[PDB]
Amino acid sequence: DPLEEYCKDNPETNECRTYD
Amino acid sequence: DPLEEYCKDNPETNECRTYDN
Amino acid sequence: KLKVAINGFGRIGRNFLRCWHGRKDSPLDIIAINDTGGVKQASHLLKYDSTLGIFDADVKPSGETAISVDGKIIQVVSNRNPSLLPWKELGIDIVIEGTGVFVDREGAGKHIEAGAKKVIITAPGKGDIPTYVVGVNADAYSHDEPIISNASCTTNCLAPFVKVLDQKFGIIKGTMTTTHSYTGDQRLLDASHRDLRRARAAALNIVPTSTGAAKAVALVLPNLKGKLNGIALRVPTPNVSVVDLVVQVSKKTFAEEVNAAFRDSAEKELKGILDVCDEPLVSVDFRCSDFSTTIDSSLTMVMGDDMVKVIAWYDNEWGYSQRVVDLADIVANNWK
Amino acid sequence: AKLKVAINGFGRIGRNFLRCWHGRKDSPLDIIAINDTGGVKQASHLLKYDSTLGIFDADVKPSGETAISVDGKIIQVVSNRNPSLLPWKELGIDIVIEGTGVFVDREGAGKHIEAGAKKVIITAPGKGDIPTYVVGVNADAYSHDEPIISNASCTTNCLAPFVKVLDQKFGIIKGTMTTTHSYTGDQRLLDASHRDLRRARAAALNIVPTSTGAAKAVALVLPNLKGKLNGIALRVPTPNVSVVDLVVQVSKKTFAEEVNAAFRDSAEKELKGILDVCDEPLVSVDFRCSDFSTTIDSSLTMVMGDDMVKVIAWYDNEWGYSQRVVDLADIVANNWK
Amino acid sequence: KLKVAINGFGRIGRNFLRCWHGRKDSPLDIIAINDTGGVKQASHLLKYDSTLGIFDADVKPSGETAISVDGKIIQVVSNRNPSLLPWKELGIDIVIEGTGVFVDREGAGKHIEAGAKKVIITAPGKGDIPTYVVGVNADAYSHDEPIISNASCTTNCLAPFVKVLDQKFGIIKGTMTTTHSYTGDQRLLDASHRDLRRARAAALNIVPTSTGAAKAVALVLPNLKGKLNGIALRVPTPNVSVVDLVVQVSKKTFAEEVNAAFRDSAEKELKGILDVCDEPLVSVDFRCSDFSTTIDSSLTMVMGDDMVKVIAWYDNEWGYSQRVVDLADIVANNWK
Amino acid sequence: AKLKVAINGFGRIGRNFLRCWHGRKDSPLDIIAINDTGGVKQASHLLKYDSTLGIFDADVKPSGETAISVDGKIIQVVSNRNPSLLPWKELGIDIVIEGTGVFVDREGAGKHIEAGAKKVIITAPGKGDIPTYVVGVNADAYSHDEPIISNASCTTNCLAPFVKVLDQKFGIIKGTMTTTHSYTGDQRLLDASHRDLRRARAAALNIVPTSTGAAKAVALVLPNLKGKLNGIALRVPTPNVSVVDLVVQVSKKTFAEEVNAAFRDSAEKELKGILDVCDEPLVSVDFRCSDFSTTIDSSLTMVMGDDMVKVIAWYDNEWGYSQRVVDLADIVANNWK
Ligand SMILES: NC(=O)c1ccc[n+]([C@@H]2O[C@H](COP(=O)([O-])OP(=O)(O)OC[C@H]3O[C@@H](n4cnc5c(N)ncnc54)[C@H](O)[C@@H]3O)[C@@H](O)[C@H]2O)c1
Ligand SMILES: NC(=O)c1ccc[n+]([C@@H]2O[C@H](COP(=O)([O-])OP(=O)(O)OC[C@H]3O[C@@H](n4cnc5c(N)ncnc54)[C@H](O)[C@@H]3O)[C@@H](O)[C@H]2O)c1
Ligand SMILES: NC(=O)c1ccc[n+]([C@@H]2O[C@H](COP(=O)([O-])OP(=O)(O)OC[C@H]3O[C@@H](n4cnc5c(N)ncnc54)[C@H](O)[C@@H]3O)[C@@H](O)[C@H]2O)c1
Ligand SMILES: NC(=O)c1ccc[n+]([C@@H]2O[C@H](COP(=O)([O-])OP(=O)(O)OC[C@H]3O[C@@H](n4cnc5c(N)ncnc54)[C@H](O)[C@@H]3O)[C@@H](O)[C@H]2O)c1
């Protein structure tokens, strides 16, 4: 939940990148 | 030393190779 | 001559550039690069590559907003928002989308706003985006379609030899495991990630991760819809990946019949896309392989006449980027 | 009445075996001698210090120039590459752990019996007709009259436990397996000469296809499996911990959780201590020092078309297997007549 | 008993927690953690560690916003802006600043704006921020100081032996190379970074990088001012590092003499801080070393009477993190 | 006619050597034979496919049971651990490249001349009193009278060239050396028996301090440096490319740019093709297949106190050294009689 929200706004960051 | 004497006769073995770089 | 911008100058973006560079009489001409970095990075990282080695071309900056690669000037911009990119200014016909963040219509379509007329996404697409694998279903490409996807590396390895198996023997069901080189979405050391497995130090672990490739093959081969599931296991190699496919087929068979069907496709319909290797090679030996799929013929088994196991090698970066170029060529030749 | 044990070949397995045994309480075994090409300098140092296991929490040092002591227990260290000449009769050795990789037939293995040992446990599959055991699977068929026995491979010790359950409960028709395996000492560091052109290649740089006899060796410990499996290995650039990927057609139509539940039940019962089921999203390194032969990754179980079943299991190839060598050696001790 | 929050639950933040957990009768009580991540990451990455192995404690979630470690609950909040953190709310005395990004008075000060009293930064500071090496000058620490630094890992290794060498032989001048495990500032595969060397695939390369560690020793040993420089080489190991120091000393000497001096420092004044290793060990063997510096004695050399070369090992994660706990025990024992 | 070369030990150097020679367009050499214990099947495979060099761009196939073919050029392959028994007289061999690493003195290397060869170049420091040459430092002092010679070590060949210039230009008083070195085939893949307890440790997991003589060996090729240099080696987990870190006290006061311009003049002149200066911020992998014995990393050049110069140089320890083996063999062939 907290890191997921960070990731919609910031998909390109270390904590978010998900390839496939 | 067991391995040291072995390596005299078998310098090319796994337990013996010693490359001085 | 069709004008291309590369958005996201990363592993695929940079591989893409070198793949195209190797091409003779390209219908494309790449005139722009955009990335989070500047000309400083674009020039250096194009020239020096830990995986590919040194680019045999004269690579330097031109001015402060461009580079030149063998005398050709290429603009370098740096905006994280694609709506704001000079595509209308520069007359970009087509964008290669390699950031891995603009994979839906709303996102990739920002390029269209900006001036671009088409977008090839170098990843599986989100939602209702058309998805093409070269040598499988990319003949079906319709120019009316502005935003398309070239699928994943895995799906490009897998679809072509799945096309042959289902055609020649008929897949009833099956399952896939890719043993995959680590990629930039894994952490170097254990650190926060949304996926707690990709959080884990990449070069120290076997890491199961989530693939969609077994379902994506259904997008380019509808007959396979519902018939495959897979997983992925990332391992501590920096490049080159392997697929292990197990299918139950309709037509009872034996190993060499299967391998022969692949060799037959390699000299005909899947010429240039599928290869059969009869030597006892290892991952590093398929570095810079231009085929989507390279069958390791000696690992082909058939158990109980209808359970076929197939192993196939792929350069996840280079071989996938050669396919992106091929799809852009197809796009450019089906320009209306 | 503790059985006197010798380790022949103080390598990855020989050393893991001693540390495994050291951690047991009220062992029926006493380990009283080691033999390697190498001598005490090596013995003592490679036991204390371990790149994979870390430092050994015990007081390890030389005693004299032909022994070591480990928390004060003196164990003799000899160095002869011919097992026929080893002082086993003198030391009253009951069991040899054949950990060399080079005495895996009867002829080679039997040389310890010539030297005076009463029993040999080979830490590898046998060549030819050597009785083979997987603890939790067929080790109850062990007969004390058998002087030379195999504990099979690490891969066969991971696979057989969950093949046993799958066949029992779902009925395996045919299947195939791939193991994604940590590099082992048998591969080359850099590209160099090997009888296997794939194991010739730099281990830590490559994904390396190589053969496994695990598929047909499962039929040795579960006979109903004869002819039904085949497999391969892929060595990967990790130093320890491996994973088996099994795909089987089964007779009972099913779905993933029923399969996972069945392993859970076994882990409670007849495979307690041998089979485990992990529900968290772990990676290879988290299974280091796992005492289980097989740890199912439950979240990866899959069924396609109701009867093609994919299962992924984790094992520590060095430690886990060696925990099973202690267990087999304990079963020998308990059946000593 | 002082109340601590960990800002930045990364390699140091979590090494710090585990190090503290290992302490007996700590004057510190850990009650909060902050990260850009969430309880879901925090509890998982704390329990499972690729470098340290599984934490032998009962780690579990305890609400949507906390975790339990061994019964003791610990709040987990998640805010990139230190000002917004609830330190006033939870009674936090001291912040462990392990984010790598609040290293100046202005940034680190926000923790105090938000209600903390003290900030301990786990990196060199920017500005004339008070900096301390335990065993070297940590005795000069004053409670007057709100924001303080524990210096780099390399500086905690280097400073303690450089202290002994200057004291007992008198350092004229000298140069340093640290051969350093990769860290999370490095890329996994070539990709953009502002440092064109840190851009490059960490686990594939020897990567030279700038260190300020040599000039920073002169902050904790002013006598060394102007006298040292250095470089770092990052290598494909995930933890544990080595410093290679060449000095010219005033007092003519010989290897064994230099080593014996170290051994004497280790029994007396740098006890628990400097150790001397007399066995032929390799890097993995110094994992979870509680010493900041372990001299490798068989590597000590003296050329032409007055050129000394000393090699020292450190666990850059655990060893430093043990020092961070010591510095905070010093802060706690001098509370006003 | 061209001098006939046989390669003994077709390992990393033997193999790099053949690939280096093949790319030369002016050569007085003809490679017509290879001996290694592993057979024609290995020879051919491991030459075509290399995990470090990639795939040999050439048509490599077997030619009978006892040879291979390289772009039509036939090359025989034999397998005898005993140089005395090799068919050198029969095959007309002029020079042997000793790449086994085990025949490093007169009486062992000598066995090749006994078997019919006339020269031996050893790809390693010689044992005893062997004439030692470094192309660009003292290789001009080779005489056709010397039947067995050494090309020293890869570290020595990187080090000597920039030490030549430093001493000539600034004057060395003393100095010390660390090489941060790619792991080599003498280290174990996983912890295992070795006469050296540090080469015993897992190469790919560890920073491994090891013994070097590279720093004294420079005195063989630069006699003015006798007694003045010492050093260590740190082996680290890369498969190739290494770097030397030299700290020296010079007699002439200077500053980094002065030192770099000096290396830079040399690179243009007396060390053309041997010494190079790098002014880009590159990393190990970028120096793969560098033909230069030494590449200064100019950005890292330091001077403390006017006279303590620290200098960092890069070398492809396999490829760049083998290009020097080729070059010494060209000097041997040009001085024939
Ligand atoms: N690596 C592979 O084998 C592989 C293969 C096929 C497809 N892909 C897909 O290609 C995409 C990228 O993978 P990769 O390996 O090249 O990644 P990468 O991380 O190396 O490259 C992504 C690039 O885009 C840049 N970037 C990120 N956000 C940006 C933004 N908003 N604006 C401009 N630039 C931005 C990054 O700085 C980086 O250069 C992903 O979707 C991935 O799944 C990867
Ligand atoms: N490493 C694994 O994952 C694994 C797991 C289970 C079983 N095994 C099997 O166990 C055996 C050993 O494997 P390993 O990984 O421990 O190998 P290893 O290479 O580390 O150990 C072999 C040891 O035997 C010694 N040796 C060789 N010849 C000898 C001789 N003639 N006399 C005395 N000592 C001799 C070596 O010096 C070495 O210390 C092999 O058969 C292997 O297949 C390996
Ligand atoms: N790892 C080492 O060897 C070592 C040793 C000594 C000191 N240090 C220093 O410690 C610092 C951290 O290094 P590390 O290795 O632990 O790095 P890391 O990347 O693992 O950790 C940094 C953590 O802080 C988080 N973060 C980033 N910005 C944040 C913010 N705005 N608010 C809250 N969290 C934020 C990240 O998500 C991450 O979890 C660095 O400055 C480093 O120089 C590192
Ligand atoms: N690899 C390097 O960077 C490097 C650099 C400079 C010098 N060298 C030197 O060259 C020597 C070899 O090094 P390498 O790296 O090629 O090692 P390597 O292990 O790859 O090659 C040694 C080869 O010699 C063979 N061999 C051993 N004994 C033999 C014998 N009796 N007869 C025939 N063949 C035999 C082996 O099978 C192997 O193919 C070492 O002395 C080393 O110091 C190596």
Short mmCIF file of C-alpha atoms in Angstrom, two decimals, chain C residues 120-327:
data_model
loop_
_atom_site.label_atom_id
_atom_site.label_comp_id
_atom_site.label_asym_id
_atom_site.label_seq_id
_atom_site.Cartn_x
_atom_site.Cartn_y
_atom_site.Cartn_z
CA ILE C 120 6.20 0.74 -30.80
CA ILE C 121 6.28 -0.36 -27.19
CA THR C 122 9.23 -2.68 -26.34
CA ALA C 123 7.29 -4.53 -23.62
CA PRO C 124 3.97 -6.26 -23.26
CA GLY C 125 1.16 -3.63 -23.56
CA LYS C 126 -1.44 -2.81 -20.92
CA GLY C 127 -5.04 -3.24 -21.97
CA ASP C 128 -6.29 -3.16 -25.55
CA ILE C 129 -2.97 -2.67 -27.36
CA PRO C 130 -2.24 -4.83 -30.47
CA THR C 131 0.71 -7.14 -29.90
CA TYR C 132 2.92 -8.53 -32.66
CA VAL C 133 5.64 -11.18 -32.75
CA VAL C 134 7.74 -11.09 -35.92
CA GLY C 135 7.53 -14.39 -37.75
CA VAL C 136 4.32 -15.28 -36.00
CA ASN C 137 1.49 -12.75 -36.43
CA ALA C 138 3.16 -9.54 -37.54
CA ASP C 139 1.94 -10.01 -41.11
CA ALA C 140 -1.42 -9.16 -39.57
CA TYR C 141 -0.17 -5.66 -38.74
CA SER C 142 -2.67 -2.97 -39.74
CA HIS C 143 -1.46 0.62 -40.28
CA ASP C 144 -4.71 1.94 -38.89
CA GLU C 145 -3.19 0.92 -35.48
CA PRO C 146 -1.18 3.82 -33.91
CA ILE C 147 0.05 2.21 -30.69
CA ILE C 148 1.43 -1.36 -30.80
CA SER C 149 3.61 -3.62 -28.74
CA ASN C 150 6.43 -5.93 -29.73
CA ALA C 151 5.75 -8.22 -26.77
CA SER C 152 8.43 -9.47 -24.27
CA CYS C 153 11.74 -11.15 -24.90
CA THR C 154 10.36 -14.40 -23.64
CA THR C 155 7.25 -14.27 -25.69
CA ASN C 156 9.38 -13.64 -28.82
CA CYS C 157 11.54 -16.67 -28.02
CA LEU C 158 8.59 -18.84 -27.23
CA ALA C 159 5.85 -17.90 -29.78
CA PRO C 160 7.76 -18.94 -32.92
CA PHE C 161 8.47 -22.55 -31.79
CA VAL C 162 5.05 -22.81 -30.18
CA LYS C 163 3.63 -21.81 -33.59
CA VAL C 164 5.45 -24.82 -35.07
CA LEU C 165 4.51 -27.29 -32.35
CA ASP C 166 0.76 -26.47 -32.49
CA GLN C 167 0.69 -26.48 -36.28
CA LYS C 168 2.68 -29.64 -36.70
CA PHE C 169 1.48 -31.63 -33.62
CA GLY C 170 -1.31 -29.67 -31.94
CA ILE C 171 -0.79 -28.47 -28.36
CA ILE C 172 -3.45 -29.56 -25.90
CA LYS C 173 -1.87 -27.76 -22.97
CA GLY C 174 1.53 -26.86 -21.62
CA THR C 175 3.77 -25.00 -19.28
CA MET C 176 6.87 -22.93 -19.44
CA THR C 177 9.79 -21.97 -17.23
CA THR C 178 12.26 -19.31 -18.31
CA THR C 179 15.68 -19.26 -16.63
CA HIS C 180 16.40 -15.65 -17.29
CA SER C 181 19.40 -13.33 -17.06
CA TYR C 182 18.87 -10.61 -14.37
CA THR C 183 17.40 -7.34 -15.78
CA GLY C 184 17.37 -3.75 -14.60
CA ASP C 185 14.18 -4.14 -12.47
CA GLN C 186 15.94 -6.24 -9.85
CA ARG C 187 17.85 -4.68 -7.01
CA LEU C 188 21.67 -5.00 -6.86
CA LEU C 189 21.52 -5.50 -3.07
CA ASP C 190 18.45 -6.24 -0.99
CA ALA C 191 16.29 -3.09 -1.02
CA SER C 192 12.66 -2.03 -1.26
CA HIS C 193 10.67 -3.08 -4.26
CA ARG C 194 6.97 -3.64 -4.80
CA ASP C 195 7.77 -7.25 -5.67
CA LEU C 196 9.54 -8.70 -2.67
CA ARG C 197 11.41 -11.25 -4.79
CA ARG C 198 12.78 -8.56 -7.15
CA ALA C 199 13.84 -6.73 -3.97
CA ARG C 200 16.59 -9.30 -3.58
CA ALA C 201 20.25 -9.02 -4.60
CA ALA C 202 20.18 -10.01 -8.27
CA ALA C 203 23.66 -11.41 -8.76
CA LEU C 204 23.47 -13.64 -5.62
CA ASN C 205 20.17 -15.45 -6.09
CA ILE C 206 17.85 -17.61 -8.04
CA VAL C 207 14.70 -15.42 -7.94
CA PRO C 208 11.29 -16.64 -9.03
CA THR C 209 9.33 -13.91 -10.71
CA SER C 210 6.04 -13.25 -12.50
CA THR C 211 5.78 -13.74 -16.18
CA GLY C 212 2.79 -13.08 -18.40
CA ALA C 213 4.53 -14.54 -21.45
CA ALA C 214 2.60 -17.83 -21.44
CA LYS C 215 -0.63 -15.84 -21.71
CA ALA C 216 0.86 -13.29 -24.17
CA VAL C 217 1.53 -16.09 -26.65
CA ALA C 218 -2.27 -16.33 -26.86
CA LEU C 219 -2.35 -12.76 -28.16
CA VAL C 220 -0.22 -13.65 -31.17
CA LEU C 221 -1.54 -17.24 -31.50
CA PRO C 222 -5.21 -17.26 -30.41
CA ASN C 223 -5.42 -21.07 -30.64
CA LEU C 224 -3.20 -21.21 -27.51
CA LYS C 225 -5.70 -19.17 -25.47
CA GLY C 226 -6.15 -20.88 -22.11
CA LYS C 227 -3.60 -23.60 -22.95
CA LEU C 228 -0.30 -22.38 -21.33
CA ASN C 229 0.91 -21.18 -17.90
CA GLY C 230 4.48 -20.31 -16.99
CA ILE C 231 6.94 -19.02 -14.47
CA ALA C 232 10.29 -17.23 -14.57
CA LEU C 233 13.48 -17.72 -12.51
CA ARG C 234 16.00 -14.92 -12.73
CA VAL C 235 19.59 -16.11 -12.26
CA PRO C 236 22.96 -14.34 -11.85
CA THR C 237 23.83 -13.94 -15.56
CA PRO C 238 23.80 -10.39 -17.05
CA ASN C 239 22.32 -11.43 -20.41
CA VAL C 240 21.00 -14.36 -22.43
CA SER C 241 18.03 -16.42 -21.31
CA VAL C 242 16.57 -19.94 -21.74
CA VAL C 243 13.03 -21.31 -22.20
CA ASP C 244 12.00 -24.74 -21.01
CA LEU C 245 8.67 -25.67 -22.64
CA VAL C 246 6.70 -28.79 -21.81
CA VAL C 247 3.55 -29.48 -23.93
CA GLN C 248 1.16 -32.38 -24.37
CA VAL C 249 0.46 -32.64 -28.09
CA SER C 250 -2.18 -34.44 -30.14
CA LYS C 251 0.06 -36.15 -32.62
CA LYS C 252 2.20 -38.89 -31.02
CA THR C 253 5.83 -38.36 -31.90
CA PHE C 254 9.51 -38.71 -31.02
CA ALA C 255 12.36 -36.25 -30.34
CA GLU C 256 13.92 -36.07 -33.84
CA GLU C 257 10.52 -35.60 -35.54
CA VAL C 258 10.06 -32.57 -33.34
CA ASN C 259 13.63 -31.26 -33.89
CA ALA C 260 13.17 -31.88 -37.66
CA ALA C 261 10.02 -29.78 -37.74
CA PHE C 262 12.03 -26.94 -36.25
CA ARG C 263 14.87 -27.35 -38.73
CA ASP C 264 12.30 -27.30 -41.51
CA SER C 265 10.79 -24.01 -40.26
CA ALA C 266 14.29 -22.55 -39.90
CA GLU C 267 14.92 -22.85 -43.65
CA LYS C 268 11.46 -21.62 -44.67
CA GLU C 269 8.83 -19.63 -42.80
CA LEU C 270 10.90 -18.90 -39.68
CA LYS C 271 14.09 -18.22 -41.62
CA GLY C 272 16.03 -15.61 -39.69
CA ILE C 273 13.83 -15.94 -36.56
CA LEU C 274 14.23 -19.59 -35.55
CA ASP C 275 17.56 -21.55 -35.44
CA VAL C 276 18.46 -25.12 -34.44
CA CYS C 277 21.75 -25.65 -32.63
CA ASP C 278 23.29 -29.08 -32.65
CA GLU C 279 26.36 -28.21 -30.60
CA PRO C 280 26.86 -28.46 -26.83
CA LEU C 281 26.87 -24.65 -26.18
CA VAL C 282 26.28 -22.55 -22.97
CA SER C 283 24.55 -19.18 -22.43
CA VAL C 284 27.45 -16.91 -23.20
CA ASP C 285 27.66 -18.49 -26.69
CA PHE C 286 24.31 -17.10 -27.83
CA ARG C 287 25.40 -13.52 -27.10
CA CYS C 288 24.46 -11.42 -30.17
CA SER C 289 22.27 -14.12 -31.67
CA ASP C 290 19.94 -12.52 -34.21
CA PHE C 291 17.41 -15.35 -33.97
CA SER C 292 14.37 -15.01 -31.63
CA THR C 293 14.69 -18.68 -30.85
CA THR C 294 17.57 -21.15 -30.89
CA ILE C 295 16.54 -24.73 -30.20
CA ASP C 296 19.07 -26.77 -28.32
CA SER C 297 18.35 -29.94 -30.35
CA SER C 298 20.10 -32.31 -27.93
CA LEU C 299 17.86 -31.40 -24.98
CA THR C 300 14.60 -32.22 -26.94
CA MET C 301 12.76 -35.10 -25.17
CA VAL C 302 9.45 -36.87 -25.77
CA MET C 303 8.01 -38.81 -22.80
CA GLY C 304 5.18 -41.31 -23.40
CA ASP C 305 4.88 -40.29 -27.05
CA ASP C 306 2.99 -37.05 -26.44
CA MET C 307 4.84 -35.07 -23.74
CA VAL C 308 7.39 -32.93 -25.49
CA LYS C 309 10.10 -30.90 -23.73
CA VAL C 310 11.90 -28.16 -25.64
CA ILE C 311 14.76 -25.87 -24.55
CA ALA C 312 15.42 -22.63 -26.42
CA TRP C 313 18.04 -19.93 -26.11
CA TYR C 314 17.67 -16.19 -26.74
CA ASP C 315 19.74 -13.06 -26.37
CA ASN C 316 17.09 -11.19 -24.37
CA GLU C 317 18.53 -7.79 -25.34
CA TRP C 318 20.07 -8.10 -28.77
CA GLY C 319 17.75 -10.62 -30.31
CA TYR C 320 14.72 -8.81 -28.98
CA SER C 321 16.07 -5.49 -30.29
CA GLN C 322 16.64 -6.99 -33.76
CA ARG C 323 12.91 -7.91 -33.68
CA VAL C 324 11.97 -4.35 -32.67
CA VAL C 325 13.86 -3.07 -35.69
CA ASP C 326 12.10 -5.70 -37.88
CA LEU C 327 8.68 -4.54 -36.60
#
